[PDB]
Design an enzyme around this catalytic site. Structure first.
Site, PDB file in Angstrom:
ATOM      1  N   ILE A 188       9.647  16.624   8.057  1.00 31.77           N
ATOM      2  CA  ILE A 188       9.235  17.474   6.942  1.00 31.77           C
ATOM      3  C   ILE A 188       9.987  18.791   7.059  1.00 31.77           C
ATOM      4  CG2 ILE A 188       7.407  18.776   5.814  1.00 31.77           C
ATOM      5  CD1 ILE A 188       5.385  16.825   6.724  1.00 31.77           C
ATOM      6  N   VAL A 222      21.905  42.735  16.839  1.00 30.59           N
ATOM      7  CA  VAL A 222      20.715  43.517  16.528  1.00 30.59           C
ATOM      8  C   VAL A 222      21.162  44.647  15.615  1.00 30.59           C
ATOM      9  CG1 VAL A 222      18.847  44.957  17.440  1.00 30.59           C
ATOM     10  CG2 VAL A 222      19.629  42.958  18.724  1.00 30.59           C
ATOM     11  N   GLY A 259      12.578  19.725  25.415  1.00 31.81           N
ATOM     12  CA  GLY A 259      11.892  19.364  24.188  1.00 31.81           C
ATOM     13  C   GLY A 259      12.088  17.885  23.892  1.00 31.81           C
ATOM     14  N   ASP A 260      13.168  17.320  24.433  1.00 29.72           N
ATOM     15  CA  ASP A 260      13.488  15.907  24.251  1.00 29.72           C
ATOM     16  C   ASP A 260      14.574  15.485  25.237  1.00 29.72           C
ATOM     17  OD1 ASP A 260      15.971  16.861  23.422  1.00 29.72           O
ATOM     18  OD2 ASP A 260      15.891  15.996  21.416  1.00 29.72           O
ATOM     19  N   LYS A 283      11.988  47.247  13.353  1.00 26.31           N
ATOM     20  CA  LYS A 283      10.889  46.325  13.636  1.00 26.31           C
ATOM     21  C   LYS A 283      10.537  46.381  15.108  1.00 26.31           C
ATOM     22  CE  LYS A 283      11.466  42.950   9.874  1.00 26.31           C
ATOM     23  NZ  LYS A 283      12.199  43.842   8.921  1.00 26.31           N
ATOM     24  N   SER A 318      19.221  20.407  27.057  1.00 24.19           N
ATOM     25  CA  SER A 318      18.618  21.334  27.999  1.00 24.19           C
ATOM     26  C   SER A 318      18.585  20.765  29.416  1.00 24.19           C
ATOM     27  CB  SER A 318      17.201  21.698  27.537  1.00 24.19           C
ATOM     28  OG  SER A 318      16.435  20.530  27.291  1.00 24.19           O
ATOM     29  N   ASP A 354      17.428  11.206  21.570  1.00 18.83           N
ATOM     30  CA  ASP A 354      18.624  11.179  20.730  1.00 18.83           C
ATOM     31  C   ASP A 354      19.757  10.549  21.541  1.00 18.83           C
ATOM     32  OD1 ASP A 354      17.358  12.670  18.636  1.00 18.83           O
ATOM     33  OD2 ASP A 354      17.734  14.513  19.766  1.00 18.83           O
ATOM     34  N   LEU A 387      22.973  46.113  21.214  1.00 16.98           N
ATOM     35  CA  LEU A 387      23.364  44.736  21.464  1.00 16.98           C
ATOM     36  C   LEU A 387      23.932  44.124  20.191  1.00 16.98           C
ATOM     37  CD1 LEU A 387      20.515  43.306  23.680  1.00 16.98           C
ATOM     38  CD2 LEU A 387      22.568  44.572  24.305  1.00 16.98           C
ATOM     39  N   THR A 426       6.136  21.965   8.278  1.00 17.89           N
ATOM     40  CA  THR A 426       7.478  21.863   8.851  1.00 17.89           C
ATOM     41  C   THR A 426       7.452  21.531  10.339  1.00 17.89           C
ATOM     42  OG1 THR A 426       7.557  24.284   9.178  1.00 17.89           O
ATOM     43  CG2 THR A 426       8.556  23.407   7.177  1.00 17.89           C
TER      44      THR A 426
HETATM   45  O1  LIG Z   1      21.873  22.876  15.406  1.00 11.75           O
HETATM   46  C1  LIG Z   1      22.194  22.264  16.423  1.00 11.75           C
HETATM   47  C2  LIG Z   1      21.308  21.543  17.286  1.00 11.75           C
HETATM   48  C3  LIG Z   1      21.779  21.006  18.421  1.00 11.75           C
HETATM   49  N1  LIG Z   1      23.096  21.121  18.802  1.00 11.75           N
HETATM   50  C4  LIG Z   1      23.587  20.574  20.073  1.00 11.75           C
HETATM   51  C5  LIG Z   1      23.381  21.562  21.225  1.00 11.75           C
HETATM   52  C6  LIG Z   1      22.029  21.112  21.759  1.00 11.75           C
HETATM   53  O2  LIG Z   1      21.855  21.522  23.110  1.00 11.75           O
HETATM   54  C7  LIG Z   1      22.146  19.598  21.640  1.00 11.75           C
HETATM   55  C8  LIG Z   1      20.854  18.811  21.615  1.00 11.75           C
HETATM   56  O3  LIG Z   1      19.999  19.286  20.582  1.00 11.75           O
HETATM   57  P1  LIG Z   1      18.437  19.501  20.844  1.00 11.75           P
HETATM   58  O4  LIG Z   1      17.838  19.735  19.503  1.00 11.75           O
HETATM   59  O5  LIG Z   1      17.993  18.308  21.622  1.00 11.75           O
HETATM   60  N2  LIG Z   1      18.341  20.854  21.763  1.00 11.75           N
HETATM   61  P2  LIG Z   1      18.357  21.106  23.381  1.00 11.75           P
HETATM   62  O6  LIG Z   1      18.456  19.816  24.107  1.00 11.75           O
HETATM   63  O7  LIG Z   1      19.322  22.184  23.716  1.00 11.75           O
HETATM   64  O8  LIG Z   1      17.009  21.697  23.713  1.00 11.75           O
HETATM   65  P3  LIG Z   1      15.694  20.955  23.724  1.00 11.75           P
HETATM   66  O9  LIG Z   1      15.109  21.066  25.095  1.00 11.75           O
HETATM   67  O10 LIG Z   1      14.780  21.701  22.822  1.00 11.75           O
HETATM   68  O11 LIG Z   1      15.892  19.611  23.127  1.00 11.75           O
HETATM   69  O12 LIG Z   1      22.844  19.410  20.385  1.00 11.75           O
HETATM   70  C9  LIG Z   1      24.008  21.783  18.011  1.00 11.75           C
HETATM   71  O13 LIG Z   1      25.173  21.891  18.314  1.00 11.75           O
HETATM   72  N3  LIG Z   1      23.499  22.322  16.855  1.00 11.75           N
HETATM   73 MG   LIG Z   2      17.377  18.252  23.707  1.00  7.77          MG
HETATM   74 MG   LIG Z   3      17.772  16.212  20.764  1.00  2.00          MG
HETATM   75 NA    NA Z   4       9.997  19.493  10.498  1.00  7.90          NA
HETATM   76 NA    NA Z   5      23.923  45.866  17.145  1.00  6.61          NA
END
Ligand SMILES: O=c1ccn([C@H]2C[C@H](O)[C@@H](COP(=O)(O)NP(=O)(O)OP(=O)(O)O)O2)c(=O)[nH]1
Ligand SMILES: [Mg+2]
Ligand SMILES: [Mg+2]
Ligand code: NA
Ligand code: NA
Ligand SMILES: [Cl-]
Ligand SMILES: [Cl-]
Ligand SMILES: [Cl-]
Ligand SMILES: [Cl-]
EC number: 2.7.7.7
Length: 326
Positions: free
Chosen positions: A97, A56, A180-181, A63, A171, A247, A53, A92
């Site tokens: 942080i 990888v 996650g948000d 590993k 997401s 956000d 892939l 972190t």
């Molecule tokens: O490093 C990054 C982080 C986010 N992004 C874009 C894509 C991501 O889907 C969107 C929102 O960021 P989140 O950190 O909210 N991630 P996402 O919504 O995909 O997943 P989650 O459920 O964890 O929030 O911003 C980037 O382009 N680069």
């Molecule tokens: Mg998000």
């Molecule tokens: Mg976000």
């Molecule tokens: Na952090």
């Molecule tokens: Na490879």
DNA sequence: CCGACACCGCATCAGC
DNA sequence: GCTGATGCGC
DNA sequence: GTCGG
């Protein structure tokens, strides 16, 4: 999660390289491998098989062989027992942080939740809120709750001005059953790549959302990007919902597609698509897609009227949001 | 071998 | 204050 | 850590 064991291993490794080693490229290297392996439709039986892939390499293949044979990885078994690495990895986890501040807090003797709480005075605004909602921010958001939140946000937005268009991306837009948000892309006819005929466009919205007690805290705030905290209202006698990260990104209405493409992600999908774009002689950001003249300098924005147009420019077949979760 | 690795908004700090 | 480097999360 | 020229 056919290869959950391997992908978790790779993710832990990526986290170690980012937080402790502060080696961003190894971080992304491990994340890419984890992602490509996560979508592999076969239960991996060996490193060799995995090494086929893209992303990888030889080191990860080994590993993978170690993990398959023993169910673990000595490198991680050691990392986990190292106090400094453990402390840094823990810190972190607090929003605000990062790797640097984490290693700095460790030097000063601040390495636990207890320490953070008693040294609130040593945290910037963002870090304080992150600490305050440490527990809540670790919890996932059920899509059901995401639907209730979308409802509040879109309606409150409409109340400020019927011309605003708020789209939930991230997401959520990709169809995830949990997030996650909440990420909201906002547009308004007054703000285009040509002019800002109205100031406070983002402020107005933030204000309305705080007024109805949906937004509770602010991590950072500017003219086009808001990072804060929100909470669904609860009914009588009902236990409160956890506080959630939210956000909001205000983007020029004429650049909606590049903006929705970017804000939908995933972040890895964007990294792959943006890299492929470069290889195809283009550069993609949340605002535009431009060609790459011989001088390596970006040219003028190309016309875009849908997400698919962006995909067409780089000779990639369109991929629905639900198929961009890399 | 080896340079490249996606791209950017907001917060905070050092230098002038 | 203005600007550029750096951190942190997108 | 991986990959392309
Ligand atoms: O490093 C990054 C982080 C986010 N992004 C874009 C894509 C991501 O889907 C969107 C929102 O960021 P989140 O950190 O909210 N991630 P996402 O919504 O995909 O997943 P989650 O459920 O964890 O929030 O911003 C980037 O382009 N680069
Ligand atoms: Mg998000
Ligand atoms: Mg976000
Ligand atoms: Na952090
Ligand atoms: Na490879
Ligand atoms: Cl392990
Ligand atoms: Cl666009
Ligand atoms: Cl641009
Ligand atoms: Cl963002």
């Amino acid at each position: 999660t056919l290869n959950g064991g391997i992908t978790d291993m790779l993710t832990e490794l990526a986290n170690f390289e980012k937080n402790v080693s502060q080696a961003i490229h190894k971080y992304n290297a491990y994340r890419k491998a984890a992602s490509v392996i996560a979508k592999y439709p076969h239960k991996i039986k060996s490193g060799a098989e995995a090494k086929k892939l893209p992303g990888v390499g030889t080191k990860i293949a080994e590993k993978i062989d170690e993990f398959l044979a023993t169910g673990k990885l000595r490198k991680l078994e050691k990392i986990r027992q190292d106090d400094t690495s453990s402390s840094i990895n823990f810190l972190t986890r607090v929003s605000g942080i990062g790797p640097s501040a984490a290693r700095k807090f460790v030097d000063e003797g601040i390495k636990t939740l207890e320490d953070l709480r008693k040294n609130e005075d040593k945290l910037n605004h963002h870090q304080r809120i992150g600490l305050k909602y440490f527990g809540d921010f670790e919890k996932r958001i059920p899509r059901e709750e995401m639907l209730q939140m979308q409802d509040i946000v879109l309606n409150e937005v409409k109340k400020v001005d019927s011309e605003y268009i708020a789209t939930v991306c991230g997401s959520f837009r990709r169809g995830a059953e949990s997030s996650g948000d909440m990420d909201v892309l906002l547009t308004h006819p007054s703000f285009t790549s040509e002019s800002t005929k109205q100031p406070k466009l983002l402020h107005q919205v933030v204000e309305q959302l705080q007024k109805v007690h949906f937004i509770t805290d602010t991590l950072s705030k500017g003219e086009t990007k808001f990072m804060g905290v929100c909470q669904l209202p609860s009914k009588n006698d009902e236990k409160e919902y956890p506080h959630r990260r939210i956000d909001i990104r205000l983007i020029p209405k004429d650049q909606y597609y590049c903006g929705v493409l970017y804000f939908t992600g995933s972040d890895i999908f964007n990294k792959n698509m943006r890299a492929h774009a470069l290889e195809k002689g283009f550069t993609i950001n949340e605002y535009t897609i431009r060609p790459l003249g011989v001088t390596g300098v970006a040219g003028e924005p190309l016309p875009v009227d849908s997400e698919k147009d962006i995909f067409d420019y780089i000779q990639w077949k369109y991929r629905e949001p639900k198929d961009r979760s890399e």
